[PDB]
């Protein structure tokens, strides 16, 4: 979308400046806690082999991007639901009300919800979200990470090997980095271009740029079908 192109531009400016190749990196000067995201994926389970990918957002809401490209979201009130068609057309409803055509998917979502709640850790549990519902537009995995694209423009990348995570927010042109110790820091990308960053964050930002392009390529392919 438009956010993807904005994010690509933001990442370009930083990466082109080679932030880790500076005389004296001052990463801390680019910090801005006020730019912490409102939403990010706290956990996910990939059962795309049969039903789809379930996930939980940091506000405790749950969602599932089924294999037929449709999405069902269950708000943290445990009753309000939002259904998004392949097109993107959304519809509001609740569990209490029994929209017959959605009972199967609602039931599937609940099993996903229970599994995640019982077996998985909540990423960013030590983070207080920013004051304010998006759905998972698309996702894919590489040999080293899972890429998650939210409908609000945010792109999240979870790295498998060291459990580090990147949350890119185009509206605020910012990025939140969670290290393996679960410590988190939020940076304004424009300040990173100015003050630089360590080689690790630099490497991940280069990879992120590559992942954003892959999202654009997938979208161009998916568009050819619609």
């Amino acid at each position: 979308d438009c956010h993807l192109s904005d994010m690509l531009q933001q990442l370009h400016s930083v990466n082109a400046s080679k932030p880790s190749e500076r005389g004296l990196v001052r990463q801390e000067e680019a910090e801005d806690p006020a730019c912490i995201p409102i939403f990010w994926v706290s956990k996910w389970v990939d059962y795309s082999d049969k039903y789809g990918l379930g996930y939980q957002l940091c506000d405790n809401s749950v969602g599932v991007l089924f294999n037929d490209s449709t999405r069902l979201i269950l708000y943290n009130d445990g009753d309000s639901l939002q259904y998004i068609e392949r097109d993107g057309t959304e519809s509001y409803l609740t569990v209490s009300s029994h929209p017959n055509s959605l009972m199967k998917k609602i039931t599937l979502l609940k099993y996903f919800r229970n599994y995640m709640s019982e077996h998985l850790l909540k990423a960013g549990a030590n983070i207080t979200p920013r004051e304010g519902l998006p759905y998972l537009r698309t996702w894919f995995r590489t040999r080293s990470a899972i890429i998650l694209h939210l409908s609000n423009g945010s792109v999240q990348i979870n790295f498998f090997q060291d459990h580090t995570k990147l949350i890119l927010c185009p509206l605020m042109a910012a990025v939140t980095y969670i290290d393996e110790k679960r410590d988190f820091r939020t940076y304004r990308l424009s300040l990173l271009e100015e003050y630089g960053c360590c080689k690790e964050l630099a490497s991940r930002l280069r990879y992120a740029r590559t992942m954003v392009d892959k999202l654009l390529s997938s979208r161009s392919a998916s568009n050819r079908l619609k």
Partner: peptide
């Protein structure tokens, strides 16, 4: 089969 950190 595949999931985030347990």
């Amino acid at each position: 089969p595949l999931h985030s950190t347990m």
